[PDB]
Design a protein around this motif. Structure first.
Motif, PDB file in Angstrom:
ATOM      1  N   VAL A   1       0.849  -1.331  -0.048  1.00 22.58           N
ATOM      2  CA  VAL A   1       0.004  -0.157  -0.101  1.00 22.58           C
ATOM      3  C   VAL A   1       0.772   1.273  -0.245  1.00 22.58           C
ATOM      4  O   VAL A   1       1.749   1.217   0.785  1.00 22.58           O
ATOM      5  CB  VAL A   1      -1.132   0.031   1.191  1.00 22.58           C
ATOM      6  N   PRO A   2       0.361   2.360  -0.808  1.00 21.62           N
ATOM      7  CA  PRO A   2       1.053   3.549  -0.683  1.00 21.62           C
ATOM      8  C   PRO A   2       0.881   4.337   0.690  1.00 21.62           C
ATOM      9  O   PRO A   2      -0.101   4.060   1.423  1.00 21.62           O
ATOM     10  CB  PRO A   2       0.234   4.397  -1.943  1.00 21.62           C
ATOM     11  N   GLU A   3       1.828   5.278   0.919  1.00 27.77           N
ATOM     12  CA  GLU A   3       1.774   5.959   2.317  1.00 27.77           C
ATOM     13  C   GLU A   3       1.788   7.424   1.971  1.00 27.77           C
ATOM     14  O   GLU A   3       1.891   8.228   2.714  1.00 27.77           O
ATOM     15  CB  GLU A   3       2.955   5.431   3.201  1.00 27.77           C
ATOM     16  N   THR A   4       1.974   7.818   0.573  1.00 31.36           N
ATOM     17  CA  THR A   4       2.192   9.129   0.130  1.00 31.36           C
ATOM     18  C   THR A   4       1.088   9.422  -0.961  1.00 31.36           C
ATOM     19  O   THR A   4       0.800   8.400  -1.886  1.00 31.36           O
ATOM     20  CB  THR A   4       3.380   9.471  -0.459  1.00 31.36           C
ATOM     21  N   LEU A   5       0.933  10.643  -1.314  1.00 30.36           N
ATOM     22  CA  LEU A   5       0.051  11.164  -2.244  1.00 30.36           C
ATOM     23  C   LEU A   5       0.687  10.623  -3.772  1.00 30.36           C
ATOM     24  O   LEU A   5       0.181  10.353  -4.500  1.00 30.36           O
ATOM     25  CB  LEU A   5      -0.147  12.547  -2.334  1.00 30.36           C
ATOM     26  N   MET A   6       1.984  10.736  -3.694  1.00 29.33           N
ATOM     27  CA  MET A   6       2.863  10.629  -5.107  1.00 29.33           C
ATOM     28  C   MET A   6       2.775   9.188  -5.181  1.00 29.33           C
ATOM     29  O   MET A   6       2.654   8.747  -6.448  1.00 29.33           O
ATOM     30  CB  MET A   6       4.284  10.778  -4.758  1.00 29.33           C
TER      31      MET A   6
ATOM     32  N   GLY B   1     -10.142  -3.276  -6.824  1.00 29.26           N
ATOM     33  CA  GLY B   1     -10.417  -4.137  -5.666  1.00 29.26           C
ATOM     34  C   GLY B   1     -10.644  -3.469  -4.447  1.00 29.26           C
ATOM     35  O   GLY B   1     -10.463  -3.915  -3.375  1.00 29.26           O
ATOM     36  N   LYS B   2     -11.084  -2.245  -4.634  1.00 33.30           N
ATOM     37  CA  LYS B   2     -11.400  -1.292  -3.381  1.00 33.30           C
ATOM     38  C   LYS B   2     -12.844  -1.435  -3.180  1.00 33.30           C
ATOM     39  O   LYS B   2     -13.652  -1.381  -4.198  1.00 33.30           O
ATOM     40  CB  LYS B   2     -10.768   0.004  -3.635  1.00 33.30           C
ATOM     41  N   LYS B   3     -13.389  -1.309  -1.971  1.00 33.86           N
ATOM     42  CA  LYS B   3     -14.692  -1.478  -1.594  1.00 33.86           C
ATOM     43  C   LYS B   3     -15.170  -0.168  -0.968  1.00 33.86           C
ATOM     44  O   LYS B   3     -16.197  -0.029  -0.415  1.00 33.86           O
ATOM     45  CB  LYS B   3     -15.089  -2.572  -0.636  1.00 33.86           C
ATOM     46  N   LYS B   4     -14.209   0.785  -0.763  1.00 33.12           N
ATOM     47  CA  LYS B   4     -14.593   2.089  -0.414  1.00 33.12           C
ATOM     48  C   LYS B   4     -14.241   3.387  -1.249  1.00 33.12           C
ATOM     49  O   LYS B   4     -13.448   3.151  -2.232  1.00 33.12           O
ATOM     50  CB  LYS B   4     -14.093   2.331   0.946  1.00 33.12           C
ATOM     51  N   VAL B   5     -15.133   4.413  -1.068  1.00 36.80           N
ATOM     52  CA  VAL B   5     -14.978   5.578  -1.897  1.00 36.80           C
ATOM     53  C   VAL B   5     -14.812   6.863  -1.214  1.00 36.80           C
ATOM     54  O   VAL B   5     -15.415   6.993  -0.139  1.00 36.80           O
ATOM     55  CB  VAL B   5     -16.039   5.749  -3.056  1.00 36.80           C
ATOM     56  N   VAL B   6     -14.027   7.803  -1.680  1.00 36.70           N
ATOM     57  CA  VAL B   6     -14.035   9.085  -0.688  1.00 36.70           C
ATOM     58  C   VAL B   6     -14.277  10.154  -2.233  1.00 36.70           C
ATOM     59  O   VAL B   6     -13.616  10.015  -3.294  1.00 36.70           O
ATOM     60  CB  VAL B   6     -12.886   9.564  -0.152  1.00 36.70           C
ATOM     61  N   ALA B   7     -14.999  11.161  -2.025  1.00 40.02           N
ATOM     62  CA  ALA B   7     -15.140  12.255  -3.033  1.00 40.02           C
ATOM     63  C   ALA B   7     -15.320  13.692  -2.216  1.00 40.02           C
ATOM     64  O   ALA B   7     -15.423  13.625  -0.980  1.00 40.02           O
ATOM     65  CB  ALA B   7     -16.359  12.055  -3.801  1.00 40.02           C
ATOM     66  N   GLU B   8     -15.101  14.803  -3.122  1.00 45.39           N
ATOM     67  CA  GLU B   8     -15.164  15.905  -2.512  1.00 45.39           C
ATOM     68  C   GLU B   8     -16.492  16.427  -3.262  1.00 45.39           C
ATOM     69  O   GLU B   8     -16.828  16.035  -4.655  1.00 45.39           O
ATOM     70  CB  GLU B   8     -13.896  16.826  -3.068  1.00 45.39           C
TER      71      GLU B   8
ATOM     72  N   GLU C   1      -9.069  18.034   2.078  1.00 45.84           N
ATOM     73  CA  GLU C   1      -9.435  17.166   3.203  1.00 45.84           C
ATOM     74  C   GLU C   1      -9.651  15.517   2.610  1.00 45.84           C
ATOM     75  O   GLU C   1      -9.333  14.697   3.175  1.00 45.84           O
ATOM     76  CB  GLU C   1     -10.515  17.520   4.165  1.00 45.84           C
ATOM     77  N   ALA C   2     -10.294  15.684   1.418  1.00 43.29           N
ATOM     78  CA  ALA C   2     -10.378  14.368   0.612  1.00 43.29           C
ATOM     79  C   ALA C   2      -9.123  13.761   0.155  1.00 43.29           C
ATOM     80  O   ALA C   2      -9.163  12.674   0.463  1.00 43.29           O
ATOM     81  CB  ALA C   2     -11.050  14.593  -0.789  1.00 43.29           C
ATOM     82  N   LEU C   3      -8.226  14.551  -0.254  1.00 46.28           N
ATOM     83  CA  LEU C   3      -6.741  14.222  -0.298  1.00 46.28           C
ATOM     84  C   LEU C   3      -6.293  13.592   0.775  1.00 46.28           C
ATOM     85  O   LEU C   3      -5.623  12.359   0.774  1.00 46.28           O
ATOM     86  CB  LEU C   3      -5.866  15.225  -0.801  1.00 46.28           C
ATOM     87  N   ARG C   4      -6.249  14.039   1.866  1.00 42.30           N
ATOM     88  CA  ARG C   4      -5.620  13.391   3.199  1.00 42.30           C
ATOM     89  C   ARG C   4      -6.239  12.240   3.812  1.00 42.30           C
ATOM     90  O   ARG C   4      -5.752  11.278   4.075  1.00 42.30           O
ATOM     91  CB  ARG C   4      -5.931  14.673   4.237  1.00 42.30           C
TER      92      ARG C   4
END
Lengths: 314, 322
Positions: free
Chosen positions: B1-6, B87-94, B155-158
């Motif tokens: 898993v990634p730990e950064t935005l990059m 393969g993701k079961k969750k979503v975030v949006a602005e 806040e969505a990015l975070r």
């Protein structure tokens, strides 16, 4: 040739309607507006989450909420308004109770450049402020009828208005409560729903659906039911809140059942249905688990549960 | 898993590339666009509007006829499906005015994804309808008090970076980091692609002009991009007054024009009376600009307006104004 009585007006309309239904150009024009303006064909959508939830038949939603206006009344009004244009008429009169038929009439009159007069009983006018305002923005003149002041009174004034302005005015009735040929004309224009549903369903499953479900409301389901009426293997379920050829069994759904259906459909299919539709969905939620997996059930959806704030408050 | 935005972005980039070349992905996507969203939307000839202006033929690209009543779903369904494929079961949006939010919650309801939507406090309090829609659809709506759209995006990015293991960010704004602007543009190109095809079928040539709203994070590139290379097709972006994007405007491929509230309200009344179509106020700005353009064009010429949103939302507020 100008009619002087209601009988003569009715006869004039009979002949005009028969001529139109035999003019390929008329049907061609009608289909053009149904496509590019109303947005037909509306999808027949496979509700797979709903299907998994009930555990029985495949559940399909005929999306009449995706018509322009968000309801199916327009199928009738546009057919009749084009007929009016074809008769060389310049004005339309109509009656309305809750406002759906009114808005639907005012809409196609704006489209086709027809003057529009709508009769509404004062009682209904008092409790449909936004719909009245919608009709006026669409350019219609709304006449508040106080003669009781119910729908029945608005109808009577509309009929008298039609007759006395019949040289240039056509009456667009939304009900099938007579006189002839109004019930036939309405049935025929509304039939595009069941006709589409039949063609789309066949193309998918290679057979007719085992069951079709629609809300009754005031006749609402004629458009969906009629094209299946000679297919006796197709069970027709009319739903009402809490013809007589025995083709339609009737069922009542309470306010609470319809609320549950509204919540489930919204959360499982991302579709926010209106209250009448929710009654239909609610009955299907009782029917589907009892049917086999290789069977299919179609629910007619009409009206938008999230058209405005006043509507979603529930 | 990634730990950064990059790293989150690189994960997205690779996943997107693979999806885009997966024929089963394009098939499924088109299936939902057709049967759920209801594409193609019609290209409607506005005959009364055309007579009124006395100039170019005026066509309305009817994005108001999509499920949800707007065109944001074209993008959310693409990215939600991408999420499932990753393969993701969750979503975030602005969301700003809520359209993207509603379109995101709608598709998460459909595909069985958890939905978290971040929204600036100022937007929450004045989008009652859209917030209730989002909650009814099963989304958690988080008010951002930091409290504009920018603050919600951040806040969505975070949140995304922190939950990147099982959460995908469905971005609607095109001011975010690569490759979001590319993804949103690609998914929204179904608007421009359809328009070009439908118009050519009708007129045997390309439109002389395409008019579309811009702003609120939106670019109209979904409508404009398929025409960018046809240099004889004028491209007009309209905002609310208060070879081959910012590039397109700077070199003059696209031009930007502002419309006032009064001009917009006028176009709103005109479209209603002339066509029986009650437009959203935002969309009305584009109609208002097309009203200035049409009379100055020839009768044998054509103009398309991208029409999105259902004006039934705004009737209540407009009645009060009148």
């Amino acid at each position: 040739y100008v009619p002087e009585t209601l009988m003569q007006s009715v006869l004039e309309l009979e002949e005009a309607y028969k001529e139109a239904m035999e003019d390929e150009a008329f049907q061609k024009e009608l289909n053009h507006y149904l496509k590019t303006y109303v947005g037909r064909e509306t999808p027949l959508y496979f509700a797979e989450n709903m299907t998994e939830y009930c555990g029985g038949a495949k559940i399909y939603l005929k999306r009449e909420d995706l018509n322009h206006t968000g309801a199916h009344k327009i199928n009738n009004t546009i057919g009749q308004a084009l007929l009016a244009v074809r008769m060389g008429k310049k004005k339309v009169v109509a009656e309305t109770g809750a406002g759906q038929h009114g808005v639907a009439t005012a809409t196609v009159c704006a489209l086709l450049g027809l003057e529009c007069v709508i009769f509404m009983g004062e009682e209904d006018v008092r409790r449909q402020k936004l719909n009245v305002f919608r009709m006026e923005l669409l350019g219609a003149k709304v006449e508040s009828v106080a003669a009781s002041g119910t729908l029945k009174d608005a109808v009577n004034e509309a009929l008298r208005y039609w007759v006395s302005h019949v040289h240039d005015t056509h009456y667009i009735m939304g009900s099938v409560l007579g006189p002839h040929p109004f019930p036939q004309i309405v049935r025929d224009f509304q039939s595009v729903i069941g006709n589409e549903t039949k063609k789309q369903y066949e193309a998918l499953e290679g057979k007719l659906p085992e069951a079709v479900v629609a809300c009754i409301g005031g006749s609402n389901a004629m458009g969906m039911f009629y094209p299946f009426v000679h297919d006796e293997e197709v069970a027709l379920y009319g739903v009402e809140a809490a013809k007589d050829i025995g083709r339609v069994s009737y069922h009542s759904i309470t306010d609470d059942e319809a609320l549950e259906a509204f919540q489930l459909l919204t959360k499982k299919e991302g579709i926010i249905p209106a209250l009448e539709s929710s009654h239909a969905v609610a009955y299907a939620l009782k029917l589907a688990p009892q049917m086999k997996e290789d069977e299919g059930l179609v629910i007619c959806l009409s009206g938008r549960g999230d058209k405005d704030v006043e509507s979603i408050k529930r």
